[PDB]
Symmetry: C4
Subunit: 219 residues, 4 copies
């Protein structure tokens, strides 16, 4: 009756993809999420989806903290929810990607968390833990490990300017990125540099992907 | 001991209309509501009542989010509470209406929700889900399906101006309305256009109804 | 283990006056209170105490909502806590009073609540329910029944000016008062009109009492 | 499954130092802490650590209320968390100290709390309860007993100026201190007066200690 994530939902006998209530250890009010019950046996809690450019992702700090969009479409679950999920157990991250020629690729990370040891994860900038790459998309996240989350209105990156402003996104920017999945929905090849839905190791710095899904499952 | 709504209250053996504590899945602190234990077998959770013009309904965003008035009289339960109720199960909506000549009518909607898949229902504007009309008042809500909630100080409608300002209410306005049950208590026929307690399919756009009650029950 | 008030604390076998954790129905985090386990068999939850003038009571809205002072001395528990207590069951109010000549008196009210049916008790001004006087101090509260709570920075009274500013207190003021137990600690007879710790039916409008305690118990 | 502190964690069979979830009586959402399972049998909940000067401690009121830094390194758990822990039972305080010549000392206090009887511990300034010194570092805290917590942006001390501003820290300042463990990480002997990580009874007023840990355990 109180699953902590989509894997508890699956193991309780819910096999269909869709929206479910989950109740993280330190977020006992709980909230709804999209559960992927198909990928590698299922039990994945979605926290990011791009598929059509219907939702504005060029949002400030409060929106990235609290979440935006709809669970059934393009959304960002919110860093306060991603923190509550990833601190309650050891999670892996799965990233699904699709181009406009219906090509697909994925990146799996054996460890993933946000603000794991932060007393105030919001003040500390929800810093990224990520390690142990495998898959077909190539690694575009390991260089972001240890970076705080940066938005157009709150700069915690390693750049003289604001990486989020410059690359029209919100991410764990260093100086600045190898991945930008919260970037502008520019729809494939673009002249502007690295400011779309980029996964540089698969499609480079001038190709805005059609589809992205970021999702977590206990190791 | 922890009913989720007025139907749980009724099925627990409370048969009297009145104020009860309910505890929605994602609002575990709970809150008090007015329960209608008579209509079509009872178990209806009230979220809106007009009966006398004693309460100001021309209120801003925060008041429509948090609720106002009194459970025993004219009130609005608050969109944060209506969201918590309608996302925890599939609800139907019942609307009771009365004119100043003691005529009555009702509208039943087989599905009703507010912000059903919204990650942040407040930021997303508590959008309306409504379908499957039946009853005697005629349908004045189906055209509002998919619209965000608009107040005098927060415009999310499909109009060049603010529908809430123009029609002195707060509603899931398109451009602008077929219903306005949070409109001014103008007391029957009025010269001003559509800015009273209107249900256009029953009494048209220049008749402010005497009584309205909006209430929900699990399908 | 989760008493809802000081009467649950007493009936659980705690017989000593002092500070205890209580957990009201709609405030499940709970909070600490002073329990009077002596008066008329005990089980009284204190929400107001004056005894020495050590604490400033001439405070604004936020302080009267959230509480101030110390449970072991002069304090105001806070209208958000008094609301959570008095809406969860039917309470009686006991008021103990002492003058500077060690005279004592009390007022008992068979029913007492704050914001009982208010959807947003804070927006609605935590209105007073009180009835059924008995005791030795005389009735100085029944005329306040139905009034909202007024502070120096938030006027909801029936006066052309601010009763809280004028009588240097915070109360369910009409125009303006018969009681002012949150008034200035002026220490007995005073020239200034009605701006001390007044209980007019016992000591009139120019006598600031030495001691007051307001406390509640389920009927 | 719901330990209230690190002693419950230890007695449940967790013997390793590290980060654990705890759930104080009036903070049922819970939070993570560093548990010291070694000192005097173990079961100590850490709330302060200095070890390297990597974290800025010269922070304002909100940061001292909410916490900052990382549980695995330098941090301050936050006065709202320290209040929730120390009001739920009778705690003792242990302070470990180390100089830059690898000398160590400790101070044990048989009673310790923050805002113990405060209705609003934040408004009341999270006042210190401390008594019953023993150990090797000497007593540098008893003179602070009864003082409110003071930061650069919120002065509650007994000084004509702001003790936190003057001594570049945050503490239960009187006029001004015998201890300053949230002071500047100045690294040993310094010319500036008393504005480093000072424990005056061990190393005087011009020696910024290398290491400090403040931690609590039920008496
Ligand atoms: C990519 O997959 C989608 C969804 O499964 C397909 O609809 C696309 O097929 C193309 O578009 C459809 C509507 C139809 O015209 C078909 O003949 C096309 O091949 C598919 N391919 C591309 C290039 O988008
Ligand atoms: C509508 O119903 C109400 C409530 O049941 C009635 O009180 C009204 O009756 C009218 O008003 C009462 C006070 C009395 O004068 C009676 O003779 C009237 O018919 C009733 N009718 C209307 C038109 O409001
Ligand atoms: C009122 O009661 C208090 C507390 O029980 C007493 O202390 C007072 O007694 C008076 O003050 C004490 C200190 C002592 O001087 C005694 O002889 C006095 O009678 C008591 N009376 C008054 C008038 O305050
Ligand atoms: C203090 O303790 C630390 C940690 O246990 C030691 O590393 C220090 O030893 C000194 O530094 C190391 C790196 C090595 O050079 C050794 O030979 C030194 O004695 C130790 N001493 C001091 C003075 O910091
Ligand atoms: C999108 C992005 O961060 N791109 C480049 C990075 O590849 C490059 O190595 C660096 C050199 O300074 O400049 C960054 O802006
Ligand atoms: C109250 C309301 O929305 N009324 C009218 C609507 O019936 C009409 O079809 C439309 C034409 O533009 O103009 C709206 O303002
Ligand atoms: C303290 C207080 O409210 N006193 C008086 C009240 O007794 C009096 O009847 C009234 C007449 O207008 O004026 C009020 O101010
Ligand atoms: C750091 C600190 O508080 N030091 C001194 C204190 O030792 C001294 O007794 C006092 C005299 O006024 O002045 C304080 O500032
Ligand atoms: Ca920068
Ligand atoms: Ca508009
Ligand atoms: Ca007034
Ligand atoms: Ca000062």
């Amino acid at each position: 009756s109180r699953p902590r994530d989509c894997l508890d939902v699956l193991l309780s006998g819910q096999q269909d993809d869709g929206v479910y209530s989950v109740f993280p250890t330190h977020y006992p009010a709980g909230f709804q999420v999209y559960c992927d019950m198909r990928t590698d046996g299922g039990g994945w809690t979605v926290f990011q989806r791009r598929e059509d450019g219907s939702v504005n992702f060029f949002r400030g700090w409060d929106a990235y903290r609290d979440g935006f969009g709809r669970l059934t479409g393009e959304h960002w679950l919110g860093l306060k929810r991603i923190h509550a999920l990833t601190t309650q157990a050891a999670y892996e991250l799965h990233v699904d990607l699709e181009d406009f020629e219906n090509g697909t690729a994925y990146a799996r990370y054996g460890s993933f968390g946000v603000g794991l040891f932060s007393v105030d994860p919001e003040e500390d900038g929800y810093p990224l833990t990520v390690a142990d790459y495998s898959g077909t998309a190539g690694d575009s996240l390991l260089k972001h490990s240890g970076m705080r989350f940066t938005t157009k209105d709150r700069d915690s990156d390693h750049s003289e300017n604001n990486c989020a402003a410059f690359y029209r996104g919100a991410w764990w920017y260093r100086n600045c990125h190898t991945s930008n999945l919260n970037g502008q929905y520019l729809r494939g090849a673009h002249a502007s540099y690295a400011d779309g839905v980029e996964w540089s190791s698969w499609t480079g710095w001038q190709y805005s992907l059609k589809f992205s899904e970021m999702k977590i499952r206990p190791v």
